[PDB]
Design a protein around this nucleic acid. Structure first.
Ligand SMILES: [Mg+2]
Ligand SMILES: [Mg+2]
Lengths: 51, 236
RNA sequence: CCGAGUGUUACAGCCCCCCCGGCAGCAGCACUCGCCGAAUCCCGGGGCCGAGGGAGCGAGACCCGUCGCCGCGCUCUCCC
RNA sequence: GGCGGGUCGCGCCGUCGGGCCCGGGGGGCCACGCGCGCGUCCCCCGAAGGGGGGGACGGCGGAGAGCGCACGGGGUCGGC
RNA sequence: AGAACUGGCGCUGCGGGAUGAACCGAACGCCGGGUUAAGGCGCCCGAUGCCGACGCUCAUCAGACCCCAGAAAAGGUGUU
RNA sequence: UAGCCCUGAAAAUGGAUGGCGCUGGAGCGUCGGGCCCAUACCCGGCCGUCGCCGGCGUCGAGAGUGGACGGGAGCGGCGGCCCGGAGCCCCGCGGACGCUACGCCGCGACGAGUAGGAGGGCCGCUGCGGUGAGCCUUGAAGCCUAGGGCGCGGGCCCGG
RNA sequence: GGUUGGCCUCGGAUAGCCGGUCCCCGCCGGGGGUCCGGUGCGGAGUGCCCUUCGUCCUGGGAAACGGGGCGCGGCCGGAA
């Protein structure tokens, strides 16, 4: 018994939707991260351009 | 032959989906429809004799051993040592001063140069400061010291490789006369080429060494633990 | 004259509390709001211990089952 | 003259629900014979009770060749 | 001494109760890794060698953990 | 009024919060986060038992969860001069193990034990009927053995 | 069996440590004013050796005592 939740491709033998549920939650938490890193820059950028 | 056209973001997950890849490959316009030498005969060579001899080579075995073990049960991907993957610790970048732990050198401080194709990281402290030639060392038997030197454009001989650094033995005598192999007294005098091609890398590691204020005194020294000096209290 | 420590009544001439209207822009956050969490969740790295046990519907197989299931790529079209 | 129960229509809320739909003016989709004809729906041209389109179909008229890889894939080998 | 209900001991090792038939956990083929229960973690004795929190208490007989192995009425301008 | 402490509070061998000791606690109460280890729990190995099976296809020619012939009509596809037709393997004569059926194999769950009851014994002792073209004065039985092993055990084999 | 040694104030803890002009104890010790430091840096969370691979060539800085000794000769301190 190889373990689901621990290796891929055993899940995908039991649940094919597990992969597309998984890159959808990797695509979005990369663009929620690119948004928040840029927004935290975007406050202190013009706050430095002030100074 | 195009490249993979689906960049992996995580290990074994493509960035583009199944129907996203049907269109990146233009699969909508490429669906398709269109639809031994055993042995040449050997000649006769003879009188009262014809029939250039029959198709036979690689014949059935002379002896079957009395018992046999069955065949193995096939497993997935356990590829041999020439094919696994090669890894480094991030603390060992080229130019790092290392600390040998386990050899015959045992605490001599060397300069890391290049990571070979076998995981054995090629290394030398120079032969004029230490007594360390161009030896390989294993990766997890060193300590990466937090000082560096930029040797990014030193030079590298392509001929020094895993096949370059090996050890050799050739068992000729099967008889138990009292020779010790007759040639394992030979501490290696193949150095005549190895003495040439260390000078070709010594000559341009040392100006990198002699530009740092007292880095060359640091490489003659050896490492030790003394009295209240504990690792895990220590920064290497 | 200044500095300091006590005791008194007095509600700004340090401040604090309760209201009556607002902005930056909100982070369970500049380790106290720590809450409760995940179809609202994934990634990566270490340390330990173990590795038990003739799969070929094909070819009439042939030195030698790198095989099934699963998930993928390239070519059998072109261009940049 | 007040209070509850059942019923209707009014505007108002919610990342409501119907994959809804219906027409108009980048991200995702395990969704892919241009020819045209089998049912069904939709938008249309002036008519006025015809045709032309697109859509989807659990039916039929349009409707093979698997090559050589890699692998979190039926319990470790090293061709260290 | 004699009943009721249930569980045990007898027929049963093991971990804890210093010790033990019956208490508390838990029931047992021979081992390796992981985790726990009851119980603990000054030193015998594995584990608090946590910069643990908050108080109460001084005994010229202190106190200290189920069964369980020592005490009552009364009394104290002893401290809280 | 009620918490801790004290008085009430006396027994015969010397003595027991288990001891040593302990008073910014190693005491008491109320809590925390760590941490420790049972034969218990989880994962893995191996042994047995029990339950449900598998394989007589040794079928390298076996192939069959539907099957053939051969005639009435239609194709996609194989070779065109739009008419068209079974090839029995062979350039290799080849292809592991097995299945004491009372045997072999697979999977899953389980394993305390007195009195007691069943099963298995290729455990052992003595004697008989068969049988090993058994063994031996080139050394049997017996006994001894810091010798080598096997079996979970009953025990057994070998060396000296 | 061990992998370098520390060659030493008394002590206080609601307190101690260092340096110090003056007047008293056979050229040393007792006191006070003064200057210091102090979550101890004149800090065993420290200190001196040292992490010393050796040698040769060869210049600077530092150092004019030499450092190991089988030396020889001397003295005098440490009885818990
Ligand atoms: Mg109970
Ligand atoms: Mg019995």
């Amino acid at each position: 018994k190889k373990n689901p939740l621990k290796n891929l491709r055993i899940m995908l033998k039991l649940n094919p939707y597990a992969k597309t549920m998984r890159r959808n939650t990797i695509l979005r938490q990369a663009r929620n991260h690119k948004l928040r890193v840029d927004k935290a820059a975007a406050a202190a950028a013009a706050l430095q351009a002030k100074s | 032959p195009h490249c993979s056209r689906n960049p992996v973001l995580v290990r074994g997950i493509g960035r583009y989906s199944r129907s996203a890849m049907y269109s990146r490959k233009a699969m909508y316009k490429r669906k398709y429809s269109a639809a031994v030498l055993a042995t040449v005969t050997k000649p006769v060579g003879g009188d009262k004799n014809g029939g250039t001899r029959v198709v036979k080579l690689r014949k059935m075995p002379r002896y079957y051993p009395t018992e046999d073990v069955p065949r193995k049960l096939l497993s997935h991907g356990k590829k041999p040592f020439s094919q696994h993957v090669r890894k480094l610790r991030a603390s060992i970048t080229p130019g790092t001063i290392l600390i040998i732990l386990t050899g015959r050198h045992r605490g001599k401080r060397v300069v890391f140069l290049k990571q070979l194709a076998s995981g054995l990281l090629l290394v030398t402290g120079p032969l004029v400061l230490n007594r360390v030639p161009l030896r390989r060392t294993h990766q997890k038997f060193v300590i990466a010291t937090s000082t560096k030197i930029d040797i990014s454009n030193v030079k590298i001989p392509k001929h020094l490789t895993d096949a370059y650094f090996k050890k050799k033995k050739l068992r000729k005598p099967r008889h138990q006369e009292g020779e010790i192999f007759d040639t394992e007294k030979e501490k290696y005098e193949i150095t005549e080429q190895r003495k040439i091609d260390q000078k070709a890398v010594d000559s341009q590691i040392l100006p990198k060494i002699k530009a740092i204020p007292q880095l060359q005194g640091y490489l003659r020294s050896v490492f030790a633990l003394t009295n209240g000096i504990y690792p895990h209290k220590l920064v290497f």
